[PDB]
């Protein structure tokens, strides 16, 4: 319940998320004949939220995501003052994991961080299924809103205590099963930023998208729970 340690929890959580989620995508998804595919990456991603929320959610609330922190503010749960420190902690944490991951990935003949996307988020060409920008937009907006509708509900007063990390993490596996072919799935501006810095080309130029669209998405989910469903 001291801020220095709350920021440490958040930096570590987002770290776990970016190391785990992206590590599975770069290291294991495509491994020939025995690789884990998109369903594997979705699972890893959502177990980074669930393990860490159980571990450090009781210290920080376990946001691990700028879009979650900003949406908790929108829905009346996080004070405007603590927002910016969390976002930075998260972004920092994610950068370190993505650099550690890069050093790992390059331990193998042929690794092209650039020519493989390095699990970066993108739309259009740099969409893995080649979905246009309007497909990228509508999917992140809907999925960020929803994501926050889950965090808000799961951690509500009259939501039986203890289970929110299960609700929230699995909602993060769900969201990846849905949107990977479309954008590789962000709904986390700090996840996109980590790997974009190591794809070095096309990722960095579409980055802004995955900062604007998840956040707007998550405010909306916060607004929908706050005004519609919470009262009571």
């Amino acid at each position: 319940s001291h801020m220095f340690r709350k920021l440490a929890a958040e930096s570590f959580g987002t770290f776990w998320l970016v190391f785990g989620g992206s590590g599975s995508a770069v290291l294991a998804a495509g491994f020939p004949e025995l690789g884990i595919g998109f369903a594997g990456v979705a699972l890893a991603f959502g177990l980074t939220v669930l393990t860490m929320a159980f571990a450090v959610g009781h210290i920080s609330g376990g946001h691990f995501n700028p879009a979650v922190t900003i949406g908790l503010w929108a829905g009346g749960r996080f004070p405007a003052k603590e927002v910016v420190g969390y976002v930075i902690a998260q972004v920092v944490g994610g950068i370190v994991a993505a650099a550690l991951l890069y050093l790992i990935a390059s331990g193998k003949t042929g690794f092209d961080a650039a020519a493989s996307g390095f699990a970066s988020n993108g739309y259009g060409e740099h969409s893995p299924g080649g979905y246009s920008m309007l497909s990228a937009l509508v999917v992140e907006l809907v999925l960020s809103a929803g994501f926050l509708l889950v965090i808000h509900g799961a951690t509500d007063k009259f939501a039986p205590a203890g289970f929110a990390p299960i609700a929230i993490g699995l909602a993060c596996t769900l969201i990846h099963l849905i949107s990977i072919p479309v954008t590789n799935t962000s709904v986390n501006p700090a996840r996109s930023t980590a790997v974009a810095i190591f794809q070095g080309g096309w990722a960095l130029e579409q980055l802004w998208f995955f900062w604007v669209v998840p956040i707007v998405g998550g405010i909306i989910g916060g607004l929908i729970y706050r005004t519609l469903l919470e009262k009571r």
Copy 2:
């Protein structure tokens, strides 16, 4: 505990279910070499129930399904008066998600909502494994009954509190692992309706089946728990 907000919860839950479940099937199941297959779609489907039940089950009970609402009435848990509003909320919610999904899917060269089924439920030709009508019937009846036998038991007085969304959602992954090759799996009349409206052809003509057969199925499960297992 106001009805307007309870209907909002239900519309949103069924929305999540149709966006998630169907979105995974249309967007990710068949993606070449890395796609999530039938086991992926089953998982997504059952995480739409579990996240949303945790999130909004404490507001509405989190039915998200006409067949569940009608079966809760049969087993003595939902009053006849509130049934019709829930069913409509659910059906509406599902329609919006299925339209949003359609706009997403069409962001990609080659998308034929019609020639691909758009994850609609069907029997005979329009059964993915080509199972006859009697296979379609017996599987939905058994699986709807069972589904409701789980909801009834999991949310029973003497069922330790908190865990029903886990029981109920996973029962929804289970049911999809079983029946997808047979009918693409409905046991949800509001799920079938959402996508059927966008397959535009063969789906709409078999629709009625997936309204009659899940409901009958779910009343039966409600009746079996009510008279057999609840008393005590």
Copy 3:
């Protein structure tokens, strides 16, 4: 807490298990290009235990398995008098599901219940990987023991209440991930019996094995928890 209803719970649980587990194996495991494989069947199997234990475990204890009932007796948890009724309830339940399943499977051109094993358990030729009898024995004995070491521990006094259906069901997914290539996995004499009656040939002649070996296995697990780990 009346016996007639406790037997109904057990018949229904074992029913769910045999319909689900085997239904996934016969209907979905091998479906070309999108099928769920051995990992899918393992999951379905273990979600039949978890949903039903949550649903009817509070009525019966949710054994769903002759080897579990007989091992609960060994470890001092189930009285010798109630054993035989449970075993029969379980076996009956399983027979009905396996017949319903058969009617479903035959709704499709080419279905050979006999030439495909119908997910029956077997050793030697009728082992899917062709493991000898000594491989069949050691795997079921170890896995039945373990299974019961989990039921005993998970439902122990000083095991925090509520979570045993998660522990026990997932132990049932685990056990299938391990042993499917070896014997298709029984550790449930009532599961083997259900489908063996519909494979009609080689299954019925190896049946006895999967009645003797799981039970011995589960008594041992009961004995190991009772004398070693419970006291205290």
Copy 4:
């Protein structure tokens, strides 16, 4: 709460882990056309921790891992005196499972424990993806630290009671989704030791690595939770 029985719990837990995790890898991962792949093995591995922690964690704490026991000491949770007995119990348990597994695997024509690695951990050639030693190091250090950051947090005073076996086991599935292509994943010095003794060649010579690197890794995670995040 007697030591003889606490050592029995630990020997049995590590046993389950090595039988399950490795059994899935040797028996099921590569089975042609229906095998469970790396995502299957990751799941089995992490369900050995979760079932056993639920089962025997309330007796011992359910460490099942020298690196976990040594890291619990570092983070101030396990007394230095009880460390060595646990490590040996764990190592013994694991040896027995790995021998039982070997007898199982050899029940099939063609089984070469040596030419197949027998799911042993290795770096360089004997890395399944051919990742250099510096990739092996950084991945285990990060993943052991993290692993212990999860155990510490999940079992913390102010972590709602009951859920730590879910947090901890799933963190063990996560860690395998990440690192299998790189080293087959150890973060468990007692897991590596079990199978290394049966690969008989290259495993035994790289062994030391997977004793030094996980432990250092897990002390660090213990140190990071102790000094940074616990106070309060």
